[PDB]
Amino acid sequence: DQICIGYHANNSTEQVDTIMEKNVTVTHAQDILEKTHNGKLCDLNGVKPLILRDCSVAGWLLGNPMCDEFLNVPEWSYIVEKDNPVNGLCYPENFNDYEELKHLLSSTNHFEKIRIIPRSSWSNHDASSGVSSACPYNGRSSFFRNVVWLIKKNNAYPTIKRSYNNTNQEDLLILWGIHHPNDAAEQTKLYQNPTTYVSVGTSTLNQRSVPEIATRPKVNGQSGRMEFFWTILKPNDAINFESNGNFIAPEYAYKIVKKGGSAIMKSGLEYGNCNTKCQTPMGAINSSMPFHNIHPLTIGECPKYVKSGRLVLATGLRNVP
Amino acid sequence: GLFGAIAGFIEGGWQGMVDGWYGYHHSNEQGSGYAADKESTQKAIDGTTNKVNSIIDKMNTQFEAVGKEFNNLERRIENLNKKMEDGFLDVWTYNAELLVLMENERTLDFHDSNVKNLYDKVRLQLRDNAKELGNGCFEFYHKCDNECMESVKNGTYDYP
Ligand SMILES: CC(=O)N[C@@H]1[C@@H](O[C@@H]2O[C@H](CO)[C@H](O)[C@H](O[C@]3(C(=O)O)C[C@H](O)[C@@H](NC(C)=O)[C@H]([C@H](O)[C@H](O)CO)O3)[C@H]2O)[C@H](O)[C@@H](CO)O[C@H]1O
Ligand SMILES: *[C@@H]1O[C@H](CO)[C@@H](O[C@@H]2O[C@H](CO)[C@@H](O)[C@H](O)[C@H]2NC(C)=O)[C@H](O)[C@H]1NC(C)=O
Ligand SMILES: *[C@@H]1O[C@H](CO)[C@@H](O[C@@H]2O[C@H](CO)[C@@H](O)[C@H](O)[C@H]2NC(C)=O)[C@H](O)[C@H]1NC(C)=O
Ligand SMILES: *[C@@H]1O[C@H](CO)[C@@H](O)[C@H](O)[C@H]1NC(C)=O
Ligand SMILES: *[C@@H]1O[C@H](CO)[C@@H](O)[C@H](O)[C@H]1NC(C)=O
Ligand SMILES: *[C@@H]1O[C@H](CO)[C@@H](O)[C@H](O)[C@H]1NC(C)=O
């Protein structure tokens, strides 16, 4: 007659690891590593992202004709841009502090477009011929829609003086540019005045840009180049533009709605008509796990990222036959 | 294991005690059977559950990457950035793996320890009424039954 002390045992196949011994079969174990996503770019808590597709942030903000899909984009949750959008600066050139502007986009969920300077306001300049074959639209030469390439009128480029006061409540993202022609002869064919500049002033901004001429190879068929600038105009501040030539004046600007909390994502995916709480560039996550190994760049309520391949916590004891 | 019980002085687990983690297997005229021990199995269940929760919570205030871009002439700060993001990732990945590992080892020992103490609470109980077989079992001398077995488990054994 007897009483025996003992412990549970089962058909559990589960295995955990320890410092001294690997692959210990245990009665019960809890996984804590989420290893799956759904392969889609979803809405984040009912809010759809801004999917730029073949357009870059630049093509979008400047109004590249091939990007009319984003002429007036609505509130977004996050932003997805391909690695190398093909439509950015149709007319070749540069974009100052482009990376700082992109990083700025991350403190915001909406850019509302508004006209701060009507295209009709240029009574003394030619606001109709500023188009290039490098910016094709409907088989004809066009140009970035949000800015205007002004041209001398009646063989004159009278000095320009424009001022715009930010009567809005939001910060104002204003974009403009200057044109660097191919040679002195082109300078005069376009603007008539040989020595020109584009001066811009706000309360914090002091700037004078002179067109820098050079001989460069053709990109999208043009040897010329454009330099784009941007500044954030505070409510109630004013911005002053003065120029006697080569000025790519602004037409539209953007009221910055700082619902803030986005950041730019890099992916070739398109929209997957789904909704999620947690999104990564590879797909979304719906998991209760404390950890995941999908991708470091995530957004929304997500589990903590780690490089682990396996992560199992022992709960029960050693399982011995 | 570390305490000698599980996979030790008690060679194997009972493939038939679906009731819990630790328990008994009595044997007398009336008959034989397994029966889990609520007090300990539960006190263990509570203890382990928290550990899981503690582990999860200690790891929720860890690093998170943020996407930034750099131009062709910002390679040093871009590498600085990448160095930093990889660094914290590796540091936190190391933390998750090592913590899981260290604690898993302790979990297996907690159970072992749990068994040796249950086993002890009975050894020092049956005192001189039963013989220690050294296989995790206790064989009494003068017959004991179910009303008697349920005594030891009841923790209220001995006419004392
Ligand atoms: C009549 C003709 O087509 N000209 C031929 C030459 O091509 C021209 O070459 C010039 C440079 O010398 C420009 O690249 C011209 O392209 C445009 C463009 O952007 O598409 C034409 C636009 O109308 C013009 N827009 C404005 C606002 O003036 C634009 C700008 O002037 C420049 O980009 C300023 O930088 O230039 C292009 O048509 C050709 O090189 C030559 C040899 O094949 O033959 C000419 O007949
Ligand atoms: C932009 O215009 C506003 C007015 O619409 C200017 O600010 C106001 O200036 C008047 C005097 O001209 C003051 O009495 C008001 O108190 C100001 N209003 C506000 C909202 O503060 C502002 O100075 C202009 N911006 C600039 C710098 O030219
Ligand atoms: C708990 O201890 C009791 C002893 O008090 C065990 O046996 C009891 O025996 C009496 C007879 O003297 C019965 O009337 C009781 O029904 C038994 N249990 C009690 C007190 O309710 C008992 O087996 C132990 N465990 C249980 C089943 O409660
Ligand atoms: C576990 O083993 C039992 C047999 O004891 C079996 O009935 C049960 O389905 C098994 N569970 C698995 C491995 O699915
Ligand atoms: C542990 O077991 C798994 C079974 O899936 C195997 O893949 C792995 O190589 C084993 N590790 C060791 C310690 O050999
Ligand atoms: C996650 O899965 C659960 C279980 O089906 C479901 O109820 C929940 O709605 C899912 N969440 C999402 C974002 O799909």
Side-chain angles (χ1 to χ4, degrees), chain A residues 1-11 16-21 24 26-28 30 32 81 99 102-103 106 263-264 266 290-291 296-298 305-321, chain B residues 6-7 10 12-15 17 20-28 48 52 55-56 59 62 65 68-71 90 93 97 100-102 104-105 107-108 111 118-119 122 126 133 136-140 144 149:
Chain A
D1 292 45
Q2 63 192 304
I3 185 61
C4 303
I5 288 290
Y7 51 85
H8 188 67
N10 64 1
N11 56 328
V16 300
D17 273 346
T18 71
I19 302 146
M20 299 200 291
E21 173 178 34
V24 174
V26 304
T27 65
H28 316 80
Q30 183 188 325
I32 58 175
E81 184 186 43
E99 288 62 44
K102 288 181 142 194
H103 175 82
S106 317
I264 300 185
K266 284 286 181 170
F291 300 103
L297 298 327
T298 74
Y305 176 76
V306 297
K307 284 189 186 170
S308 306
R310 188 194 180 65
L311 217 54
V312 193
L313 270 173
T315 68
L317 53 150
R318 181 173 308 233
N319 185 35
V320 186
Chain B
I6 298 177
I10 298 187
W14 294 329
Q15 258 283 44
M17 183 172 74
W21 281 327
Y22 337 105
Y24 314 76
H25 177 43
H26 57 45
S27 172
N28 59 37
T48 297
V52 173
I55 277 172
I56 294 185
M59 296 296 204
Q62 62 145 61
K68 301 160 193 297
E69 296 189 70
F70 303 87
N71 68 36
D90 290 323
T93 286
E97 277 161 31
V100 160
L101 241 57
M102 288 190 292
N104 274 346
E105 182 157 275
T107 299
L108 298 193
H111 284 299
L118 179 69
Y119 179 84
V122 166
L126 297 175
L133 281 23
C137 297
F138 288 117
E139 184 173 303
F140 328 68
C144 158
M149 237 70 197

